[PDB]
């Protein structure tokens, strides 16, 4: 009968997400440390790790 | 080329690699190995270099 | 204990949206009016805008 209208509370913004919780993705690859003897740094690919 | 939703599913050679940008990634799954891709991505910069046929005697 | 269901009142659809407010895109080229000479209307590109 009388509109009564104040308003509603949202101070926050409610978000939804992806099924699985993580977004795009992109392939990648372990590296390890080979020491950079008297130079910088190698990089090489360690093979315990599925690239 | 790398839009969202888009790199939400599968590459395929047709639709992104050829129109587009075709940067590479996007060039390597449809594949998914070594093979092709190498040679594939080769010829979308400059061109192929077997069309010239530049090599003697087979 | 007693059950009074008659449904619910949804005669509007509710929508999300994307977090910043447009979701694909499509890059774009100015192209100012640079008119045609006596008939056809030519065009050309623009250096005041970005690229
Ligand atoms: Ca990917
Ligand atoms: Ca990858
Ligand atoms: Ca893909
Ligand atoms: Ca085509
Ligand atoms: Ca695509
Ligand atoms: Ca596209
Ligand atoms: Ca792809």
Redesign the interface.
Known sequence: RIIENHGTEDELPNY?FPLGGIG?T??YQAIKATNGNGGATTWAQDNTFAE | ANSFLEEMKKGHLERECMEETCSYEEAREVFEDSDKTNEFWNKYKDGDQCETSPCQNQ
């Open positions: 939804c795009v992109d392939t």
